[PDB]
């Protein structure tokens, strides 16, 4: 995360972290339940073997209060496109049930029609992660968060050098030095309504980080709410 701030305790409890073979976090995710994790499809191809670490809030010091779970199964969108990053969404069914606790709790999945009118129409959303604190910098020590204004498709598309499909949306600032970044990918984009946080986007990609003229690109989760429930009703 570039800009923003560190999450306070129990503030971004739906934040999961995919760690590679070297227990190095390489992508974020969103706890959907005690067994499922929402992530980006492209993240499924950046580690030979990965696990899911939740409750973790400082990658350097082992404060504890966290846990690593083995992925029983991985459900990627059969339409994921490596070149455009369209259909960039996935769900991982854990081998062991997450034990919700302080800093480990799920984010609500909204109802499609209601999300598009009551959430997606809001002024801002919240994206978090252990990504990079600058395009060139390194991954942050502690979990961070950022409030990113929703951007209109038109403006989004006119700013992109890559196609913005309908399974995507923009969020962030034109020139303000704040945005998501590598490492935050797959992570949560949440929108609050009456103090309840609903999953609204997945950190997909962007042209750099906090780069003037450009924004961050996320996977419009509303287009996949039916897909998700499907995936979530498995083995």
């Amino acid at each position: 995360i570039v800009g923003g701030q560190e999450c306070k305790d129990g503030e971004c409890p739906w934040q999961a972290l995919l760690i590679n073979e070297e227990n190095e976090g390489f992508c974020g995710g969103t706890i959907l339940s005690e067994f499922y994790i929402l992530t980006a499809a492209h993240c499924l191809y950046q580690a030979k073997r990965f696990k899911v670490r939740v409750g973790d809030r400082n990658t350097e010091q082992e404060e504890g209060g966290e846990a690593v779970h083995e992925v029983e199964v991985v459900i990627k969108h059969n339409r994921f496109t490596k070149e455009t990053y369209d259909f960039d969404i996935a769900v991982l069914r854990l081998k062991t049930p997450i034990t919700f606790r302080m800093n480990v709790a799920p984010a609500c999945l909204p109802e499609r029609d209601w999300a598009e009118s009551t959430l997606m129409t809001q002024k801002t959303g919240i994206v978090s992660g252990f990504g990079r604190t600058h395009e060139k910098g390194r991954q942050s020590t502690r979990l961070k968060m950022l409030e990113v204004p929703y951007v209109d498709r038109n403006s989004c598309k006119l700013s992109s050098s890559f196609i913005i499909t309908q399974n995507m949306f923009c969020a962030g600032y034109d020139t303000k030095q704040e945005d998501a970044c590598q490492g935050d990918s797959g992570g949560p984009h949440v929108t609050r309504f009456k103090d309840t946080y609903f999953v609204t986007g997945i950190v997909s990609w962007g042209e750099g980080c906090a780069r003037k003229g450009k924004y961050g690109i996320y996977t419009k989760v509303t287009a996949f709410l039916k897909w998700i429930d499907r995936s979530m009703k498995t083995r």
Binding site: W14, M102, L109, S117, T118
Partner: protein
């Protein structure tokens, strides 16, 4: 005289009080002069639902995300289990 002006609307009943009139609203009207609708669709205040709102026959119907049960009043959502979704964690 307070009621001489018949300040009430929607067939409400003006009833001059101590030193001020009063309107006893009909079913579905409120406010000092029964000039407001008590019935509001999802467009206004989310129809008073705590979470999801939707209309069914020109009438609001609330709902909640899994892990929640709709209050008996038909609006509020009550977390059934220990760590309901979308809520930050305490303790």
């Amino acid at each position: 005289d307070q009621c001489e002006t018949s300040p009430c609307q929607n067939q409400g009943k003006c009833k001059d009080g101590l030193g001020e009139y009063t309107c006893t609203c009909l079913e579905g009207f409120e406010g000092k002069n029964c000039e407001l609708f008590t019935r509001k669709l999802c467009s206004l205040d989310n129809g008073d639902c705590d979470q999801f709102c939707h209309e069914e026959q020109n009438s609001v119907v609330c709902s909640c995300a899994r892990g929640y049960t709709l209050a008996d009043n038909g609006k509020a959502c009550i977390p059934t289990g220990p760590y309901p979704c979308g809520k930050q964690t305490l303790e």
